[PDB]
Amino acid sequence: DMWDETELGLYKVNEYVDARDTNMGAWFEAQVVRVTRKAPSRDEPCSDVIYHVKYDDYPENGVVQMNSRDVRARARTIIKWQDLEVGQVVMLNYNPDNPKERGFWYDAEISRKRETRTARELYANVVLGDDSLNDCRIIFVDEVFKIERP
Ligand SMILES: OC[C@H]1O[C@@H](O)[C@H](O)[C@@H](O)[C@@H]1O
Ligand SMILES: Cc1ccnc(C)c1
Ligand SMILES: Cc1ccnc(C)c1
């Protein structure tokens, strides 16, 4: 059984978060509607939460259960071009199917960062996690966000 949990969650009921969609790996704004933990044993004291969220722009998907690694405070600060560097882990916009076009917001690890006379080159390992897309050219180099880690 799922038990409602009021203490362990970093995020609380009614709070808005970014949540990572289980099917395609991008982050979307969502509201936390419930926070739960697995029931403890009868003979064990209470002392990792499951968040239950509803996406702001996709209410038709209903309430969805999220691992704690797939919920975080809403992105709010851009890392400007001058401050980006290889090895940073960031949230950026990429379209895996049409890479020249606007897409969705994914975690990424910067793999190349160079400015030449001709171009500002930013490459990153995108959809970081299982089957990440390695060394992708990033178009939207002025819209790279810091990941919030409260
Ligand atoms: O977390 C549960 C939810 O996961 C979603 O991916 C499914 O589309 C829903 O049918 C389901 O209720
Ligand atoms: C457009 C889109 C795609 C995948 N997941 C969500 C929540 C929205
Ligand atoms: C642009 C943006 C800002 C904050 N969160 C997300 C998912 C996207």
Swiss-Prot record:
Phenotype when changing D57A: Slightly impaired binding to histone H3
Impact noted for substituting E29A: Impaired binding to histone H3 without affecting the protein folding
Tudor-like 1: region residues: 9-76
Organs and tissues of expression: Expressed in thymus, bone marrow, testis, lung and heart. Overexpressed in breast cancer.
Segments crossing the lipid bilayer: none
UniProt effect for mutating Y55A: Impaired binding to histone H3
Post-translational modification summary for this protein: Ubiquitinated; which leads to proteasomal degradation. Autoubiquitinated; interaction with USP7 leads to deubiquitination and prevents degradation. Polyubiquitination may be stimulated by DNA damage.
Phosphoserine found at: S41
Reported effect, D21A: Impaired binding to histone H3
Induction: Up-regulated in proliferating cells, and down-regulated in quiescent cells. Down-regulated upon adriamycin-induced DNA damage, in a p53/TP53 and CDKN1A-dependent way. Induced by E2F1 transcription factor.
Ranges for region Tudor-like 2: 83-150
Record's subcellular location: Nucleus
Chain residue numbers at which the record places covalent cross-link Glycyl lysine isopeptide (Lys-Gly) (interchain with G-Cter in SUMO2): K146
Disease per UniProt entry: Defects in UHRF1 may be a cause of cancers. Overexpressed in many different forms of human cancers, including bladder, breast, cervical, colorectal and prostate cancers, as well as pancreatic adenocarcinomas, rhabdomyosarcomas and gliomas. Plays an important role in the correlation of histone modification and gene silencing in cancer progression. Expression is associated with a poor prognosis in patients with various cancers, suggesting that it participates in cancer progression.
Function noted in UniProt: Multidomain protein that acts as a key epigenetic regulator by bridging DNA methylation and chromatin modification. Specifically recognizes and binds hemimethylated DNA at replication forks via its YDG domain and recruits DNMT1 methyltransferase to ensure faithful propagation of the DNA methylation patterns through DNA replication.
Domain-related comment: The tudor-like regions specifically recognize and bind histone H3 unmethylated at 'Arg-2' (H3R2me0), while the PHD-type zinc finger specifically recognizes and binds histone H3 trimethylated at 'Lys-9' (H3K9me3). The tudor-like regions simultaneously recognizes H3K9me3 through a conserved aromatic cage in the first tudor-like subdomain and unmodified H3K4 (H3K4me0) within a groove between the tandem subdomains.
Summary of subunit composition and partner proteins: Interacts with DNMT3A and DNMT3B. Interacts with DNMT1; the interaction is direct. Interacts with USP7; leading to its deubiquitination. Interacts with histone H3. Interacts with HDAC1, but not with HDAC2. Interacts with BLTP3A. Interacts with PML. Interacts with EHMT2. Binds hemimethylated CpG containing oligonucleotides. Interacts with ZNF263; recruited to the SIX3 promoter along with other proteins involved in chromatin modification and transcriptional corepression where it contributes to transcriptional repression. Interacts with UHRF2. Interacts with FANCD2.
Protein name: E3 ubiquitin-protein ligase UHRF1
Organism: Homo sapiens
Lineage of source species: Eukaryota, Metazoa, Chordata, Craniata, Vertebrata
Positions spanned in the full protein: 125 to 283 of 793
